[PDB]
């Protein structure tokens, strides 16, 4: 499948090779939950782990399913 990544200058999406089928989007308020806040991360994965709200990651089993929450649609 294809997931969104943020491990570069601009955010893009690639096709995970024989290893990952799910995508992930990390979120956690950086010392600015008011202004900056929830830092947004991106990447592909095979499983879907869980953690405390302080550091959570949304995992999906679809394509382009892990985009920025504030990404301008359209």
């Amino acid at each position: 499948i294809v997931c969104h990544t943020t491990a570069t200058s601009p955010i893009s999406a690639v096709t995970c090779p024989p290893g990952e089928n799910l995508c992930y989007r990390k979120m956690w308020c950086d010392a600015f939950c008011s202004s900056r806040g929830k830092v947004v991360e991106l990447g592909c994965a095979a499983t879907c782990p869980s953690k405390k709200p302080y550091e959570e990651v949304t995992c999906c089993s679809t394509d382009k399913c892990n985009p920025h929450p504030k990404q301008r649609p359209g």
Binding site: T6, R36, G37, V39, V40
Partner: peptide
């Protein structure tokens, strides 16, 4: 680096 929920702009660590 990564991005914050605020905007889609890049953010140095």
């Amino acid at each position: 680096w990564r991005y914050y929920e605020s905007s889609l702009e890049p953010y140095p660590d």
